[PDB]
């Protein structure tokens, strides 16, 4: 998944600024996951 994105990142300052573009992709996954889990706890076994 991510490796299958990081090799097209090679396909198209080198490994300094370009390397700091790799880190958003694993962040974008994480905000997808954490935002989902937060949904299914504040409702469905409501903490709040």
Q: How far is CA 37 from the centre of its chain?
A: 15
CB 27 within 8 A of CB 15: no
CB 11 within 8 A of CB 4: no
DSSP symbol at 43: S
Q: How far is CA 22 from the centre of its chain?
A: 10
- How far is 34 from 36, CA to CA, in rounded Å? 5
Instruction: Provide the token pair at 1.
Output: 């998944």
- Report helix, strand or coil for 34: helix
Burial class (CB in 10 A: 0-12, 13-18, 19+), 22: middle
Handedness of CA 30, 33, 36, 37 (dihedral sign): negative
Q: Compute the CA torsion angle 13, 3, 40, 38 (nearest 10 deg).
A: -20
């Amino acid at each position: 998944e991510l490796d299958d994105v990081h090799d097209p990142l090679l396909a198209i300052t080198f490994e300094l600024t370009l390397r700091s573009c790799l880190y958003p992709h694993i962040d974008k996954q994480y905000l997808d996951c954490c935002g989902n889990l937060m949904q299914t706890l504040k409702k469905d076994y409501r903490l709040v």
